[PDB]
């Protein structure tokens, strides 16, 4: 069956360049096209071009010429894209497509994920925020981290209702995370709540619990 | 270049019922437009082609259909696997356009925000830093707004926000806003207080506190 195999998530500084690869399997290669998408969040889904392996002969939207490069290896079975001079645009989830026969696009790559930044590894700060002095609502904030992502529990990941844990958002080039636990105010202090934060990337793994101030 | 148009960007739907998302090219795209579907960190599928022919691996509750310019795709018996952005494509001509894309959402009741203040963690304002942290949870629609005040004086300088997808349990949303700064400045005002404009209120839901107790 035919089946497309990107390469793996990519981080590169501003300037440089990016290879994204593609193994398209289960099918003659070279006869059919691939097609490149964007997907930018707030930016939808964007086509990059296309290329056919068979003469690597190459179709580019007109907005990416010079961007984007398009390259077949037919003994491989893989094709490749690169992204020149990248940067905050420039960072996305990249798609490789197969259409059907010519047109609509009926196989699709899993994806490949490109982060641009200046940021360097970073072990985030994990700060316990316990309420002002019936229910009560508890809080861990992670600071300043990179790269993506972290993982955080609470109580080992045993509590697990009444929590909300907050998609990550850039600050001053670094990541910040928060999440909240509520538990019924007759629970805590009571019982010990704690918040566990980890970070496979500066192997940062931290455990704090939340005290009353 | 062929634009493609999504009105709604947004729609509230709710399981077991009919749901048609809109998509109008802005030149004769003939019936070459197809249609995809995309889950939260997952790649795009293809549900329809030649804007009324479903592609294989498809419920039935999915079919499209166009007008002149005006293309349809239509979800009966809508069901909370069909929660997804469908975007709609056209194949006409070079360069490939996308729609902007339509995220379905299953409607409720509203509910106000619970809101909850956090100031700095002693553990953060030893290391030098203030953050304040305010939680607005399970609230409904997703549409909201937050104000930070410090001493009556409002400030948009410096404050981060993040937002939960809808909650696939409940229904609802919930947000995040960090007001950051540098502990002088944090350490020279007294009242620190943070406002929420929502559909659910006449009255803007107001929490506060004051530094030291
Ligand atoms: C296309 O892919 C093939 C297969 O990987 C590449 O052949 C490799 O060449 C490198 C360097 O010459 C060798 O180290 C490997 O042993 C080769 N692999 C195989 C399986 O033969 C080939 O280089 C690629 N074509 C181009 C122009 O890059």
Redesign the interface.
Known sequence: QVQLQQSGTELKKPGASVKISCKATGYTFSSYWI?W?K?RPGH????I?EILPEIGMT?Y???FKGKATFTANTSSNTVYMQLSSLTSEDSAVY?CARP?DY????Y????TLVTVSAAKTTAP?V???????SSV?L?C?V?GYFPEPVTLTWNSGSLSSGV?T????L?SDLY?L?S?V?VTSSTWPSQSITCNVAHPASSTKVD?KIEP? | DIVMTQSQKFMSTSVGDRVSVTCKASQNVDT?V?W?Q?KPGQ????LI??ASNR?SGVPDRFTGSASGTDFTLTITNVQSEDLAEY?C?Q?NS????????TKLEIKRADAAP?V??????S??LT?G?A?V?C?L?NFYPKDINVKWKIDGSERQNGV?????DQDSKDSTY???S?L?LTKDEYERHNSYTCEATHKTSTSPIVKS?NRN?
């Open positions: 097609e998408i997907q939808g889904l964007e086509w071009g179709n939207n007109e907005n798609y059907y047109s609509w696009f009926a699709w790559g899993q994806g700060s700060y316990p925020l316990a309420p002002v002095c609502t809080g904030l600071k909300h907050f998609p990550a958002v600050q910040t928060s909240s509520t704090k101030r | 070459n197809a995809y995309e790649s795009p599928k293809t082609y030649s592609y975007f494509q194949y070079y360069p490939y356009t996308f729609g902007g894309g619970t909850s203040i956090f100031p700095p963690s553990e953060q290391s830093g953050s942290v939680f949870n981060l926000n993040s937002w939960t919930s947000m995040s960090t950051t506190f107790e």
